[PDB]
Amino acid sequence: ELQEKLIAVNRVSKTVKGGRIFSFTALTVVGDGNGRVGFGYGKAREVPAAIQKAMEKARRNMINVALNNGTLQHPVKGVHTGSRVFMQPASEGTGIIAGGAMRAVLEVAGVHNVLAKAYGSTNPINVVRATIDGLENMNSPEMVAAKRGK
Amino acid sequence: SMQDPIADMLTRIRNGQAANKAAVTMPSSKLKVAIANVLKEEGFIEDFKVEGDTKPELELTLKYFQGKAVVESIQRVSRPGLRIYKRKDELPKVMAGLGIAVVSTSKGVMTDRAARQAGLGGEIICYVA
Amino acid sequence: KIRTLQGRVVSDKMEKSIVVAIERFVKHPIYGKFIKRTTKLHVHDENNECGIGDVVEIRECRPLSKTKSWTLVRVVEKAV
Amino acid sequence: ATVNQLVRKPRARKVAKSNVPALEACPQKRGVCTRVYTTTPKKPNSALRKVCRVRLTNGFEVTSYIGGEGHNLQEHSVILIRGGRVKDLPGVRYHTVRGALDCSGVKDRKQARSKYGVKRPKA
Amino acid sequence: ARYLGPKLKLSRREGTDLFLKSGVRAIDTKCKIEQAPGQHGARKPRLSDYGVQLREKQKVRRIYGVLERQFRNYYKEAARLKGNTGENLLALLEGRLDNVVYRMGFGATRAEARQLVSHKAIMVNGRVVNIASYQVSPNDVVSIREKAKKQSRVKAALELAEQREKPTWLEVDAGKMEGTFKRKPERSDLSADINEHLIVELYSK
RNA sequence: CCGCAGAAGAAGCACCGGCUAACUCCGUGCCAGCAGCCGCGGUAAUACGGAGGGUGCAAGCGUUAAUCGGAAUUACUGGGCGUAAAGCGCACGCAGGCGGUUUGUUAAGUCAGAUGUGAAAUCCCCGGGCUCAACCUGGGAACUGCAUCUGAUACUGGCAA
RNA sequence: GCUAGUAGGUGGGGUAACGGCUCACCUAGGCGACGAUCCCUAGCUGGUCUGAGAGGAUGACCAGCCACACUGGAACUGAGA
RNA sequence: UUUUUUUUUUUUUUUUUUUU
C-alpha cells in the first residue's frame, strides 16, 4: 500500500548545429504509512518511462522518521548550500501546513503536524534534496536519552 | 581567548568532540568548571576530572557516539558588554519542549529548567541544543 | 539619604569653591555601554584640603549662589 | 545574453517601458484647458481630437488627451486628469474623465454603464 | 440573499447525497454525476490543488446556505478559539438555528429550514431569533412555536427521517417537537463526508 | 405580538483572460482603445468593442489617490562581507573601544520579591440584558519602566592583594 | 565656529520660592569634534488600518496640550477674563 | 612569447494553443 508522487520537472530542450533537441526527466518521492519516507530521480526517451525509472529508485528502504505520534520531536538539520533548512512541528492537532513545494515528502507517510514553507530558496529541488539527506541524521528518543544519559 | 571571558569553553567542546577524541583538556576558569559539572550531571559528556589541584587543569570525557559531536546544535548567545540577562519566564524553552539551555545566576551555573523552577532569571551562557 | 557622587577635582578658580565634575549617572534607553557623558558638579568647598588631586564624596546643600548646591564630605580615592 | 543590448525589449509583450516624468505633488488633478490645438502632421492621422495644453506648475510645459467621446471640450473648461498615455500620443503624459461642467462626454451610449456613469435603457 | 436556486444545479456540482434536498425523487436520478453533469467538457475535465479545496468551501457555503459574509465572520473569532478547523467553523454551520431545526426534522430540506426560521415558526427557549446565524449551544433548547408545531412540512420531515440515521449529538421529541444538542459535534461522527480542515488552509493557498 | 388579504411590495454590477472566478458567437483593422505586474490588438483580437448567456456575489460589485504585502531589508530585539552593495596601496600616534584572572571583599547595574502608579472604554478572556446579531456591558487580568525597601550573588564595574 | 549680565566673584536689591532670574562693579571667564552654532521639518498619547512583529506609519474618537474665533498687540475690571 | 591574403553583406518573418 506504498504512496507514490512527482514533485518537479524540466522543459530541458535546446538549440544545436542543427535544429532542436529535447528530454524527459522526473524527481519523485515514495513512502509507507507507519513512518517511512524516500526519494528518487530518473529520465527516459518518454514521459511515464522517466516517472517509472524515478519511482523505482524512490522505492529504496525509506527512512523511518522519528514520529511520536502524528509528528516529530526535533528540528533535525536538512543541511545544504544555504536552504538552511529546518522544519517546525505543530502541536499534534492542526495539519501539515508545510511548503507545497516539498509537502509531498511528509504526506507520503501521513505526517499530520509539521509546518515550514520554502525558507531560503524559490526552488522545490533545493529543499527536497536538503531534507532526505538530513532526515537520515535523526535521533531516536532512546538516542537523545543516551546522549543525555546512558 | 582573553577578548571574550569565558567563550572558548563552548568552542573547545565542539572542536575536540567532532575531531574523533573521547577527551579534551585545558586550563580551568571562574565559570568553566561549573559548566563541566552540569554537562556531566545531565549527561552530554561521560565524565569530567580536574587535575594539579593547587593550579589545576580541567579535563572532559567527550561522547564520541557515531563519530559526531553531541554539541553540534549548540549556540553561546551572551557576548562582551551586550549581555543577555532574561527574567524567570522570559527564559529558553527550545525544541518544542525537549530543551535545553545552560545559564548562570544568583545560585551559580545551572540549566534553564532548574532556573525556571527555582523561579529565577539570569545570564544566558548557551542554548545546549 | 544623600546622593554621594565620586568627584575628580577638575577645576579650581573660586576662594571657597571647586568643580568635581564626573559622568552623569541618570541613564536613558540605549545600546549597552556605560553612561560616559559629564555633569557639572559645582561645590562650595571651604577647607580646600582636597586641592587638585583627590577624588571626593559630596552631599546636597543650598545654592547660596548661582545653582552651586553641593558640599564636600570625604576623600573616596587618595591624592593621585 | 550581452545584457546591455538584451535588456531593452527581449520577450515580454506588455513591455514595461513607459516614460512618466514630472511630480511636484500628485497625479490625480484638475486641469484648465488653457489654449486648444489640432496641429502637427503625424503617422496616426489623428482626426477631430483637439489635444490641448494645461497650465500645470511642474517645471516645464505639458499637454493632455481628450480621454473619452463628446466633441465639445472647449478652451474655457477645467476637467479631471489621470495617467494612461497610449502608444499613439507623442509629448502628452495624461488622459481625462471629461463630462464635468457643460462638456458632457457620453451621449446616449446605453452600454457605458459603470465605466462612465449612465442610467438604464428600456429593459 | 442566500442564492435561492436552481437548487438542484448546486447538486450537479457540489455532488451526491446532500441535505439541501434530502427527501424525494430527485436524489441520484437527476443530479447527473456518473451520467455527465457538465456535458461539453465531460470528455476530459481537470481539477487544481487549490480548486479542490475551493469546491469544498463551496460544499460548506451551499449545503448549509450561508453568505461570504458569514464565512469571514465565523473565521473572525476562530483565530481566538482553541480546537481544530472542523470545531472552530464547520460544527457551527451544523448547529446555527436554520440548520439544527432541519437536523431534528422541523423541516424536510436544508433550504426549507432557513425559510421556516425567518418566518417566526421556531424559537430558542422563547426567543424568536430570525437572526438565524445565532448558534444553539448544548443542553439549552429549540422548539417550533404552538401554532406551527405539527404543521404539514414537520410531518413530511419526521415520518421521513424515521427510516434514516438520526444522530446522538442532539435529542428531540417527535410528537410535541422541541430539543437541544446533548453534547458538542465531533469531527469523527458529524457525518459530513468533508475534509473539515480544507476551508481555513484555503486562506494560506 | 394576534386574525384577515396577496408571493404578494424587495437587485443588481464587475463582467467574462489566466490571478479567487463562468466562454464563446462576433466586430473594427497596432482603428477606437483599458494599461496593474502580466497580458491584449500587428484581417481568423476568448476579457479592445458589440451581443448571447450566465457568474462571482447579493445592498452590495468592481476599482481608485497612497504603501508595507508575498519578500526576508537599517537588524540593542532581527544581518548579509566570492556576488547586488561587500575589510577602503598606507598607519607616524592624539583621543576613544577590549584591557591579562582570580582570592579576600562589594551589590550600583543582575535577578526575585514585598509595596506604590496605570480612576474608566483596552489589547487578552468569560458571564450576560434586550428576540437578538450586533449593541449594551459587567467581571477576570496584564503593563518591562520609575518609586520605597527586603534580599539572593552567577556576570557588568569596582576595592585590597 | 557660539557667548555679552554672558561667566565667576563682589555685594546692592526684592521672588510665595532658586538664580548673570539680574544691574552696577572688579576681572575676563564660559562652550566645542563624548555634536558648541544653526536649521530642519513637525502636533505628541493611551492607542491603533494592519501582528511571532521588533519594522512602515498616524496623533484626529475621548480628552490631555495648547491656542484661538477679523490682523490682534496688550493693560484694566472680575475669585474666575 | 612576430602574428594586417582586400573591407563591407537591409529590416522583417520563421518560430504547431494550454493547466499538468
For residues E16-44, one letter each, b for 16 or more C-beta atoms within 10 angstroms of the residue's C-beta and e for the rest, the string is: eebbbbbbeeeeeeebbeeeeeeeeeeee
Taking the C-alpha atoms of residue A100 and residue E204, their distance in angstroms, rounded to an integer, is: 11
Does residue E136 fall inside a structural domain?
yes
Indicate if E102 and E175 belong to the same structural domain: yes
Domains assigned to chain B? 5-69 (3.30.1370.30), 74-128 (3.30.1490.10)
**Using CA atoms, how far apart are residues B115 and B112, in angstroms rounded to an integer?**
5
Tell whether E101 and E133 lie within a shared domain. Answer: yes
Distance CA A78, CA A136 (A): 9
Q: Which nucleotides of F are covered by protein (CB under 7 A)?
A: 1-3, 11, 13-15, 20-21, 24, 30-41, 49-51, 57-59, 61-62, 64-66, 71-72, 76-77, 96-103, 109-113, 124-126, 131-133, 146, 149, 151-156, 159
Residues E54 and E132 in one domain: no
Query: Three-state DSSP class for A35?
Result: coil
Q: Do E49 and E115 belong to one domain?
A: no
D76-112 burial, b at 16+ Cβ within 10 Å, e below that, comes to ebebbbeeebeeebeebbbbbebbeeebebbeeeeeb
Q: Are residues E49 and E113 in the same domain?
A: no
Residue in chain C lying closest to B85 (CA):
C32
Grid cell for residue E121: 415558526
SS3 D29: strand
Contact E84 A94 (CB under 8 A): yes
Range of the domain at E42: 7-93+190-204
Same domain for E138 and E105: yes
At CB < 8 Å, which residues of chain B contact A?
A: 42-44, 63, 65, 70, 73, 95-96, 98
Inside any domain, residue E84: yes
Q: Which nucleotide is the nearest neighbour of C13, by CA and C1'?
A: G8
First to last CA, chain B: 24
Q: Which residues constitute the domain of residue D102?
A: 1-123
* Count of structural domains, chain C: 1
DSSP letters, chain E, are ------HHHHHHHH-SS-STT-SSS-TTTTS-TTT-TTTTTTTS----TTHHHHHHHHHHHHHTT--HHHHHHHHHHHTTS-S-HIIIIIIHHHHBHHHHHHHHTSSSSTTHHHHHHHTT-EEETTB----TT-B--TTS-EEE-GGGSS-THHHHHHHHHTTS---SSEEE-TTT-EEEESS---TTTS---S-TTHHHHTTT-
- Name the structure determination technique: cryo-EM
D88, closest nucleotide (Cα–C1'): F30
Domain count of the fold of chain E: 2
Residue E185 in domain: no
E89 and E140 in a common domain: no
B105 Cβ nearer than 7 Å to chain F strand: yes
**CATH code for the domain of D73:** 2.40.50.140
The grid coordinates listed for E204 are 494560506
Per the CB < 8 A criterion, the answer to whether B98 and A144 are in contact is yes
Range of the domain at C37: 3-79
- Resolution for this PDB entry, in angstroms: 9.0
E98 shares a domain with E85: no
Instruction: Find cell 506504498 and name the residue.
Output: A2
Chain E residues touching residue A100 (CB < 8 angstroms): 49
Q: Which residue is nearest to nucleotide F97 (CA to C1')?
A: C33
Same domain, residue pair E175 and E151? yes
Q: Of A120, A108, A21, whose CA–CA distance to A78 is shortest?
A: A120
